[PDB]
């Protein structure tokens, strides 16, 4: 549906970036402070290219109905289009994990992993490529439910191809990128699987700053390397089977899933359905 901007009461900025921002608002049409708290995404600097990219993003989210995908609530028109989503009270999985390290066990991490795989399998069914799987893009509804919380880089596959070539201006999250995304700008369900492997790594490191993917790769590449060279050196490291280490305390069977996601050969990477089965099997064994 449509939301009138005049009844959208700003409460707090939730997160930013060069694209725009996400705000916590209260949609109070009766002006009696009984309206619901919603999350509002807006474009900070909007070209006609950015406006059209954001229109596709809204259509993509509107088309998704799944327990592990943040709910689309509507749009807001002024010139300045806004995407209205449900408010998830625990924020990103990155921040929630980091704050409750001592209360979240491996069985709990695997419950979240399984939800991410299920939400991602639903995406693939619509031929959508997320392109930005990271714990900062996963939101926490409650202690038992996580949801893919942003679709800013999501692309629809062409009808004739299993990949999508795209080189966006700006800073790309290169330490989550599959080798073929770095070398050829090719994005597919298989590069989403590679990035999912990195999400799995992030979870089992409990978001330790020293143990983060930029920190680990930047150490393996050498902090003396800078600029466009980092990309070149990362490509070479990946090409020579250089990988993120097994996180402290991580079981071998969980690191095995990560390394299987990090296959150089695109076609050898597991599917999200197989990842979900495997994760479920492991958490049943643990329980
Ligand atoms: C607290 N609840 C919510 N916080 C949100 C968002 C979206 C972001 C956010 O800024 N981004 C994330 C999508 C990836 C990013 C800018 C796009 N943040 C910040 C986050 O809490 C950091 O802990 C959200 C929330 N509820 C529903 N949504 C959509």
Coordinates of N, CA, C and O and ligand atoms in Angstrom, one line a residue, residues 12-17 19-24 38-41 57 61 70-71 85-96 132 134-140 148-152, ligand 1:
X12 N 14.9 7.7 14.7 CA 16.3 7.5 14.7 C 16.9 7.0 13.3 O 16.2 6.4 12.6
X13 N 18.2 7.3 13.0 CA 18.8 6.8 11.8 C 19.3 5.4 12.2 O 19.8 5.2 13.4
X14 N 19.1 4.4 11.4 CA 19.4 3.0 11.7 C 20.8 2.6 11.1 O 21.6 2.1 11.8
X15 N 21.0 3.1 9.9 CA 22.2 2.8 9.1 C 22.3 3.6 7.8 O 21.3 4.1 7.3
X16 N 23.5 3.9 7.4 CA 23.8 4.7 6.2 C 24.6 4.0 5.1 O 24.6 2.8 5.0
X17 N 25.3 4.9 4.3 CA 26.1 4.5 3.2 C 25.9 5.4 2.0 O 25.1 6.2 2.0
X19 N 24.4 5.6 -1.0 CA 23.2 5.1 -1.6 C 22.0 5.8 -1.0 O 21.1 6.3 -1.6
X20 N 22.2 6.0 0.4 CA 21.2 6.7 1.2 C 21.2 6.2 2.7 O 22.3 6.1 3.3
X21 N 20.0 5.9 3.2 CA 19.9 5.5 4.6 C 18.6 4.7 5.0 O 17.7 4.6 4.2
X22 N 18.7 4.1 6.2 CA 17.5 3.4 6.7 C 17.2 4.1 8.0 O 18.2 4.3 8.8
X23 N 16.0 4.5 8.2 CA 15.5 5.2 9.4 C 14.5 4.4 10.2 O 13.7 3.7 9.6
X24 N 14.4 4.6 11.5 CA 13.4 4.1 12.3 C 12.3 5.2 12.4 O 12.7 6.3 12.8
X38 N 8.1 1.4 11.9 CA 8.5 0.8 10.7 C 10.0 1.3 10.4 O 10.5 2.2 11.0
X39 N 10.6 0.6 9.4 CA 11.9 0.9 8.9 C 11.8 1.5 7.6 O 11.0 0.9 6.7
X40 N 12.4 2.6 7.3 CA 12.3 3.4 6.1 C 13.6 3.5 5.4 O 14.5 4.1 5.9
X41 N 13.7 3.0 4.1 CA 14.9 3.1 3.3 C 14.6 4.3 2.3 O 13.6 4.4 1.6
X57 N 14.6 -2.6 -6.9 CA 14.8 -3.1 -5.6 C 13.4 -3.2 -4.8 O 13.2 -4.3 -4.2
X61 N 11.7 -6.7 -3.5 CA 11.2 -7.0 -2.2 C 9.7 -7.2 -2.1 O 9.3 -8.2 -1.4
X70 N 12.9 -9.9 5.2 CA 12.3 -8.8 5.8 C 11.0 -8.4 5.0 O 11.0 -8.4 3.8
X71 N 9.9 -8.1 5.7 CA 8.6 -7.8 5.0 C 8.6 -6.4 4.5 O 8.8 -5.4 5.1
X85 N 9.5 -0.9 5.2 CA 9.6 -2.3 5.6 C 9.2 -2.4 7.1 O 9.1 -1.4 7.8
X86 N 9.0 -3.6 7.5 CA 8.8 -3.9 8.9 C 10.1 -3.6 9.7 O 11.2 -3.7 9.2
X87 N 9.9 -3.2 11.0 CA 11.0 -2.9 11.9 C 11.3 -4.2 12.7 O 10.4 -4.8 13.3
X88 N 12.6 -4.7 12.6 CA 13.1 -5.9 13.3 C 13.9 -5.4 14.5 O 14.9 -4.7 14.3
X89 N 13.3 -5.6 15.7 CA 13.9 -4.9 16.9 C 15.3 -5.3 17.3 O 15.9 -4.5 18.1
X90 N 15.9 -6.4 16.9 CA 17.3 -6.7 17.4 C 18.4 -6.3 16.4 O 19.6 -6.6 16.7
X91 N 18.1 -5.6 15.3 CA 19.1 -5.1 14.4 C 19.8 -6.2 13.6 O 19.3 -7.3 13.4
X92 N 21.0 -5.9 13.1 CA 21.8 -6.8 12.3 C 22.3 -8.0 13.1 O 22.6 -7.9 14.3
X93 N 22.4 -9.2 12.4 CA 23.0 -10.4 13.0 C 24.4 -10.1 13.4 O 24.8 -10.6 14.5
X94 N 25.2 -9.3 12.7 CA 26.5 -8.9 13.0 C 26.6 -8.2 14.4 O 27.4 -8.7 15.3
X95 N 25.7 -7.2 14.7 CA 25.7 -6.6 16.0 C 25.1 -7.4 17.1 O 25.6 -7.4 18.2
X96 N 24.0 -8.2 16.8 CA 23.4 -9.1 17.8 C 24.4 -10.2 18.3 O 24.4 -10.5 19.5
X132 N 25.2 -9.5 -2.1 CA 25.7 -8.9 -0.9 C 25.4 -9.6 0.4 O 25.1 -9.1 1.4
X134 N 26.3 -11.0 3.8 CA 27.2 -10.6 4.9 C 26.3 -10.5 6.1 O 25.1 -10.2 5.9
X135 N 26.8 -10.8 7.3 CA 26.0 -10.7 8.5 C 25.4 -9.3 8.8 O 24.4 -9.2 9.5
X136 N 26.0 -8.3 8.3 CA 25.5 -6.9 8.5 C 24.2 -6.7 7.7 O 23.5 -5.7 7.9
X137 N 23.9 -7.6 6.7 CA 22.7 -7.5 5.9 C 21.7 -8.5 6.3 O 20.6 -8.6 5.6
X138 N 21.9 -9.2 7.4 CA 21.0 -10.2 8.0 C 20.4 -9.5 9.2 O 21.2 -9.0 10.0
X139 N 19.1 -9.5 9.4 CA 18.5 -8.8 10.6 C 17.9 -9.8 11.5 O 17.5 -10.9 11.1
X140 N 17.7 -9.5 12.8 CA 17.2 -10.4 13.8 C 15.8 -10.0 14.2 O 15.6 -8.9 14.8
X148 N 16.9 -12.1 5.8 CA 17.7 -11.3 4.9 C 17.0 -9.9 4.9 O 15.8 -9.8 4.7
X149 N 17.8 -8.9 5.3 CA 17.3 -7.6 5.6 C 17.5 -6.4 4.6 O 17.1 -5.3 5.0
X150 N 18.2 -6.6 3.5 CA 18.4 -5.6 2.5 C 18.6 -6.3 1.2 O 19.2 -7.3 1.1
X151 N 18.2 -5.6 0.1 CA 18.3 -6.1 -1.3 C 18.8 -5.0 -2.3 O 18.5 -5.1 -3.5
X152 N 19.6 -4.1 -1.8 CA 20.2 -3.0 -2.5 C 21.0 -3.4 -3.8 O 21.0 -2.6 -4.7
Ligands
LIG1 C1 17.1 -2.2 14.3 N1 16.3 -2.6 13.2 C2 16.7 -2.5 11.9 N2 17.9 -2.0 11.7 C3 18.3 -1.9 10.4 C4 17.5 -2.1 9.2 C5 18.3 -1.9 8.1 C6 19.5 -1.4 8.6 C7 20.7 -0.9 7.8 O1 21.0 0.2 7.9 N3 21.1 -1.6 6.7 C8 20.9 -3.1 6.8 C9 20.0 -3.8 5.9 C10 21.4 -4.0 5.8 C11 21.9 -1.1 5.6 C12 21.8 0.3 5.2 C13 21.2 -0.7 4.3 N4 19.5 -1.5 10.0 C14 20.7 -1.2 10.9 C15 21.0 -2.4 11.8 O2 20.1 -2.3 12.9 C16 22.4 -2.4 12.3 O3 22.4 -3.1 13.6 C17 16.2 -2.6 9.5 C18 15.8 -2.8 10.8 N5 14.5 -3.3 10.9 C19 14.2 -3.5 9.6 N6 15.1 -3.0 8.7 C20 15.0 -3.0 7.3

